[PDB]
Ligand binder design. Structure first.
Ligand code: HEM
Ligand SMILES: [K+]
Length: 250
């Protein structure tokens, strides 16, 4: 694992458990799981291992980081969460947004991603430009997830299945529509649809398509399309790692 999780107080631990339950009801009612998942992923995916900059350290709430074009629309997510966060002043924003990401997966029917508290809020956003480009292919994915974040090729494929919930918006990225027929249900449908090719009303980004043609990504796509249990396992492993980049000695 390579992780040493810090100690937090009993009151901090109580606030986590209470916030997890409040976040479930809220995120379920507001129907905003995919947006919250996108928020935690964009917050965490700025980590660069060589410099140990970026990562899930609460800087995504900064107007400066929200302005990054890859984060178009995430100011909505931040705004939605601010009243709830105010009820848990003991929690770092880093912990709160990561926990909201975990919850987003859980309440849509997804795996139970393990959560460890202790992220401290960092003073300055990372540089813009570290997040992936939907028009690019497999070398780019490996640059971003592997060379920067330090994730594996398996992680890239499983985390891409994050697209099993939610949708693109032509006013945000310019892409438009859901990847799946059930955008509020977390399951292995992203991989099913990607394999079955194009279907009316359904989205596939070039970055999604790049997974089909890579000798390593493709068998993972196939495995996940065949076995949702194996997708859920690899997904929970990868999300945990992502949510913990630069935190607790990795
Ligand atoms: C593999 C590289 C990736 C690229 C190029 C990419 C790109 C995109 C784009 C362009 C959108 C639509 C933005 C919009 O117009 O609203 C989107 C949405 C989304 N992404 Fe990704 N993404 C990637 C990976 C991931 C990962 C790793 C996760 C989390 C595990 C994730 C979770 C989501 C979710 C849940 C949505 C829907 C947001 C909503 O419904 O509002 N994506 N992604
Ligand atoms: K789905």
């Amino acid at each position: 694992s390579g992780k040493s999780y810090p100690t937090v107080s009993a009151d901090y631990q109580k606030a986590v458990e209470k916030a997890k339950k409040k976040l479930r009801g809220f995120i379920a009612e507001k129907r905003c799981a995919p947006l919250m998942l996108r928020l935690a992923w964009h917050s965490a995916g700025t980590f660069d291992k060589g410099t140990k900059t970026g990562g899930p350290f609460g800087t995504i709430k900064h107007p400066a980081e929200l302005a990054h074009s890859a984060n178009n629309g995430l100011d909505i997510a931040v705004r939605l969460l601010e009243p709830l966060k105010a009820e848990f002043p003991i929690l770092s924003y880093a912990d709160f947004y990561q926990l909201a990401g975990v919850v987003a997966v859980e309440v849509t029917g997804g795996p139970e991603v393990p959560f460890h508290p202790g992220r401290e809020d960092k003073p300055e956003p990372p540089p813009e430009g570290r997040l992936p480009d939907a028009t690019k292919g497999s070398d780019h994915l490996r640059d971003v997830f592997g060379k920067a974040m330090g994730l594996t090729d398996q992680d890239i494929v499983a985390l891409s299945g994050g697209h099993t919930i939610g949708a693109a918006h032509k006013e945000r990225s310019g892409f438009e529509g859901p990847w799946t027929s059930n955008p509020l249900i977390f399951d292995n449908s992203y991989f099913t649809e990607l394999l079955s090719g194009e279907k009316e009303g359904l989205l596939q980004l070039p970055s999604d398509k790049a997974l089909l043609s890579d000798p390593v990504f493709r068998p993972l796509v196939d495995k996940y399309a065949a076995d949702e249990d194996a997708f859920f396992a690899d997904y929970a492993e990868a999300h945990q790692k992502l949510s913990e980049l630069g935190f607790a000695d990795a």
